[PDB]
């Protein structure tokens, strides 16, 4: 059966269909409730790299789709524009009322290419892409999502503190070369011509701080070729979740354009 | 079941958001021409982690995925908005699907005040015996 | 509440169409490939203002509309079908979602008849008791 | 809540959700019936150049439909056919299984231009577009509806009066510029080449004895030209709602053809 | 009404197919990226012709048509998932949509035990009268 | 009412609407099930000649489609890709998430032509197309289908015997001229230029030994043209119901080529 919670004796268990437990009051279809949680909130890492391995590409299993109505806010959430070398989309357009996940307060953005190898693109530990109260088991083109997983509850009747500052989004954007395999490279983009070469270990606060100070000190490219940064082990970057957590940086110049930035 | 986390981690608050399913109208606000946008329609609030409930949540989330995901797969529908409909069904099912045998442990009356309407009226023609 | 028609005019009479959700069908009429086209379905009446309850409903839909808008801007569901059957279970679970204490305002169970079968019973042993 | 209606005491009254009446009896889910009333049967003003001015365009509000089982049979119902002056289409197409209102005596049938400033038209005091058995938020292309709006019901298990000569419809049809604005311009078809300039007091019957009038008396275009006639306000016409209610017109002519019609 | 097979032939047996809707998941074999192709999700079974039921069953499905087919032409949705939903909502209203009143042939409620509790308290003061 | 059958009395029945039953007992959702039942289990003639007599061509009925949980295992089932004679698709292509049944264990696959008069082909005598877990009243294109009825049941919770060697499955391809109509006639396909003329006698173990025993005769054609084989009457075949129950052949030869086959 699908797990239902109930809260007995000041504590949250599975109801147990055996059972029957007359005390408890079931007096409104209000007092049943669909949560969906975000997989950020159980220390997953967040990265792009780290995330993108959980999902891959299935064909055979017809996509599946279940509402849930209320969520978490995200810090991170994610948006793929994947094509095949030849061109064609690695990813079907998001049916009629499936749009992005509300809360977000990074959206990673990915563009780029994979062999793509399946029908859908499921995620690999049976977690869900959770939309605008929607989950469903696969990804959609161009619209964001987080990777979560839906509880349904009998809240108590009394407890009424159980779903009744501004809300700010940024899009960091990425391009990808072999996505969805195990030799697959990213870029961050800090212009349509100037990139650095991401690390797992970058979050989107040190992003977002390299980009600013590329702009400011004038590292951007002046040609109309491509220049890629790279950031050596050195440098320092913010192993600590998100909810409990300059002129310094030298750069160095070495068709195209590899580059150092150093400490 | 007892819901025990065994997570890496467990963000120990809920920023929440969700819908006002019947929000208190401001005007003409409810009219779908006037009203807000798409994104312009979740409320939010917090909960924090009082009787350890968002961190049962949390695991309660993650243990309900493969029933889940095995009730999606053997379902035709292609998306499913039935599932609490269908807990509400089984509630009633399970108490009133049958007889109810009044003091039997699966029927849920309570005659205790019925008792004390005619255990009062023991004396009603007992002690009122001339 | 009470329903008070403020419309600036009331057609007292309805002449409603619907569908025979269960036609006492004719021969073969019942099977799709024989039966009537999409504009076939339909029948017919006509209801007068008896009760007032025509000027009523008109008024019943108006006031309606504000809750039944806030309802579709915050479903998912593109067309929703199940606002009859979900009054139906909350109908159910208003009056048969806890137990049911007998006497009490919110249990509706009558034991006026179960008096009258153990008040017919006082005699039954009092009576004689020879 | 979303009221529900029962009748007590000889009245219909909306159900209190906070008490509890043990009398009310719901034996079956047949007792529970959604109606859908005309905005007609309240009075509104039903000629075009009104009715049109209730609905409006507007971007960012996803479209919803509910059904009903019960409808009234109306007397007006509108079909629109608008572009914007770039020929793309302003309406959506009608989705599967969304067809036209069932019951109509008369159906204008709008076709024009406009600027159609919003990817859908809505209704601007919230009502909803009736179609069959489906009420909307939205207008959709060239589909017949009816304005008006939807209430549900206990009915007592007793009263079996409570849903359960023939039915004609007659298409009037009109062209419009500057549809969904202030300076919205319509004229009454009476041939491709035969116009009639409307105003707000012409009764779908007026235009169809006009129409009938111009035929017989031999008033349509002899050319490849457009005629438009126009009615000066000294000329009679069916302010009375429909459920409670000739060799005499003088034809006079003033590229193009402007004209006026005396009495 | 009591079922009359009234086919030409009858298969008294019944090889079925089904999905396991709460299958005990091997493994990762519950996660839709591992498991099953839509075409390895069914389970099968053999059911042979005790009490008639097999020759019953196929009667019950052809007598089902006509009210199916009306109940269809009246519906519009494109799909119906919701007819057993819809039964076991009128079960329940059948025996709890009103008042239930003891002892009465359409209330579900058994005091036989009920009556035992009290009539075994007869003696607890008629025969304690000391 | 839809009925719903009940076992009393060692005895499947429709349950009374009117009567109220109190020792009847549903505990859970789980005890209801719709369950899909083969026509082919009542004895009708499942040869593609009388199966496709049963089927024709309406238009103004709009589809309808309802799920069932449980199946039978089909030894015949039909997958039709029938054109009009100008190549236009007579069938529309399978909605989403409708598949084909999962148990054939012949699938007569049948292209070819008619004149298709009308929007929908509907099942003659009321029955459904049964597809994967949804039964339609319409034949979709390419899309493998059983013809069946559908049963709704409460389960006693005690018999737990309802619905708890391999599966293999093979497709015989035939083309149609004037399908749908009282002149059709088909062709049961050995190879692409080699056919042999259809009867309702054909089994399909019949069909596919003969296939095979033209095969390893090498009587199939063995030019750029079309070799029709044709079966005079005192060939034998295997009127008995599935369930229940060479070097012999000689050919001889009579743009085109006909021939027939002795014994
Ligand atoms: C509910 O919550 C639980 C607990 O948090 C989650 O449990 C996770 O389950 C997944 C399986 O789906 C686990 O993922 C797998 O981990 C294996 C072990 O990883 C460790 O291995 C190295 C070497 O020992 C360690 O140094 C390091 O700590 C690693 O973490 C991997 O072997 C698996 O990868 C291999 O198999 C998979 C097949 O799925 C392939 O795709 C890979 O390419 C590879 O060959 C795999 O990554 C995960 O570790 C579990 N976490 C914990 C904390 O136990 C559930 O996932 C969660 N449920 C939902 C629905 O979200
Ligand atoms: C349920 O039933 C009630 C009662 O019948 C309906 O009430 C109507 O509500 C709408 C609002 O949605 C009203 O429409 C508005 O009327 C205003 C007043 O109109 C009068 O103003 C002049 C000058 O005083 C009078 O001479 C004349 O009598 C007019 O009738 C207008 O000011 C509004 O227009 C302006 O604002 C709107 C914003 O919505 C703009 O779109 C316009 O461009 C314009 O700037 C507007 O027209 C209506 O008058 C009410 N009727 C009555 C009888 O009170 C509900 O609508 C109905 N509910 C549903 C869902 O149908
Ligand atoms: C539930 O189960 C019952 C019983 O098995 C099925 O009953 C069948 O109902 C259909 C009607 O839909 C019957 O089909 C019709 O049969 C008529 C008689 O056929 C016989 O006629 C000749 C001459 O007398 C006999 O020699 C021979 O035995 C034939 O079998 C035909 O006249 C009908 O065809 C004509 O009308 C139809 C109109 O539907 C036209 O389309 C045709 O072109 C033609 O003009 C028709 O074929 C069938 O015979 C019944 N069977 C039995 C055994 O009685 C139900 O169909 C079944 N329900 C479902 C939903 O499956
Ligand atoms: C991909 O992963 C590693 C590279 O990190 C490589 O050694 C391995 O051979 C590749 N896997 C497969 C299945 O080819
Ligand atoms: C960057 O490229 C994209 C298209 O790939 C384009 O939409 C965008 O305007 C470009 N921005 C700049 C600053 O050139
Ligand atoms: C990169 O920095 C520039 C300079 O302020 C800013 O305009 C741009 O939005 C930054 N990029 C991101 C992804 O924030
Ligand atoms: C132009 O780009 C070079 C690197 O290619 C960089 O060193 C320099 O700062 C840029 N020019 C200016 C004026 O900043
Ligand atoms: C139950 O209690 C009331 C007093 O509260 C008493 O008067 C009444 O007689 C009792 N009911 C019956 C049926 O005797
Ligand atoms: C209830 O009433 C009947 C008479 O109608 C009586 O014979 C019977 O004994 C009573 N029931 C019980 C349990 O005593
Ligand atoms: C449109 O309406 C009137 C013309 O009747 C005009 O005076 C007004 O300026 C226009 N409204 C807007 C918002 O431009
Ligand atoms: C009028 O024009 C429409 C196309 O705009 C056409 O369908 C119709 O046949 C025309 N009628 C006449 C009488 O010319
Ligand atoms: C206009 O009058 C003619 C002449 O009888 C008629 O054929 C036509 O249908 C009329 N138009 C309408 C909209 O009724
Ligand atoms: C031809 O049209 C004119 C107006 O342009 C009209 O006066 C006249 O009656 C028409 N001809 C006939 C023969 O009716
Ligand atoms: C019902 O039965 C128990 C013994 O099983 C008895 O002790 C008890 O007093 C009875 N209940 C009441 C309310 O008197
Ligand atoms: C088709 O059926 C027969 C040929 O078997 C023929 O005699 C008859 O005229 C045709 N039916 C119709 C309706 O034309
Ligand atoms: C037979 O023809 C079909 C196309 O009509 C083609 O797909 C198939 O490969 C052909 N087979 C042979 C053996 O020529
Ligand atoms: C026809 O016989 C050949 C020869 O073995 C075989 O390959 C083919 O599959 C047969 N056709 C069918 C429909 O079984
Ligand atoms: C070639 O086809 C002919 C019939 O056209 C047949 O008799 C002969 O057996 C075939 N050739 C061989 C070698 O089998």
């Known amino acids: 059966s699908i797990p239902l919670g109930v809260i007995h004796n000041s504590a949250l268990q599975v109801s147990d269909v055996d059972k029957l437990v007359c005390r408890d009051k079931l007096s409104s279809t209000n007092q049943l409730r669909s949560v969906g949680l975000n997989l950020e909130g159980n220390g997953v890492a967040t990265d792009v790299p780290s995330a993108t391995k959980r999902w891959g590409f299935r064909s055979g299993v017809p996509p599946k789709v279940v509402n849930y109505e209320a969520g978490e806010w995200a810090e991170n959430c994610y948006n793929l524009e994947i094509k095949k070398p030849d061109g ?14 509300p809360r977000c307060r990074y959206v990673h953005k990915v563009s780029g290419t994979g062999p793509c190898a399946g029908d859908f693109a499921f995620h690999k530990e049976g977690a869900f892409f959770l939309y605008d109260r929607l989950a469903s088991t696969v990804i959609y083109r161009g619209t964001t999502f987080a990777e979560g997983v839906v509880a349904f509850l009998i809240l108590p009747q009394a407890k009424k503190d159980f779903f009744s500052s501004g809300y700010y989004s940024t899009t960091i954007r990425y391009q990808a070369t072999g996505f969805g395999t195990n030799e697959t490279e990213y870029l961050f983009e800090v212009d349509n011509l100037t990139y650095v070469q991401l690390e797992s270990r970058f979050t989107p606060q040190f992003l977002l701080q390299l980009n600013e100070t590329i702009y400011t000190s004038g590292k951007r490219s002046n040609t109309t070729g491509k220049l890629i940064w790279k950031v050596n082990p050195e440098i320092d970057t913010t192993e600590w979740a998100f909810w409990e957590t300059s002129e310094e940086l030298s750069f160095t110049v070495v068709x195209x354009x590899x580059x150092x930035x150093x400490x | 079941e007892a819901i025990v986390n065994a997570q890496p981690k467990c963000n120990p608050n809920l920023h929440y958001w969700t819908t006002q399913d019947e929000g208190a109208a401001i005007g003409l606000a409810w009219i779908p021409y006037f009203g807000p946008a798409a994104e312009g329609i979740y409320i939010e609030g917090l ?5 350890g409930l968002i961190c049962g949540l949390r695991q309660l989330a993650n243990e309900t995925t493969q029933a889940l995901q095995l009730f999606l797969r053997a379902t035709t529908e292609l998306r499913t908005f039935s599932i609490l409909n269908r807990k509400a069904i089984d ?20 005659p205790h005040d019925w008792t004390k309407n005619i255990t009062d009226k023991i004396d009603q023609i007992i002690h009122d015996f001339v």
Do not use: V
């Open chain 2, 91 to 110: 509630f009633l099912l399970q108490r009133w699907g049958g007889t109810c045998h009044i003091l039997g442990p699966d029927c849920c009356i309570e």
């Open chain 1, 88 to 101: 064609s989309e690695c990813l079907p357009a998001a049916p009629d009322g499936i749009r992005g996940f």
């Open chain 2, 47 to 51: 909960m924090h982690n009082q009787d």
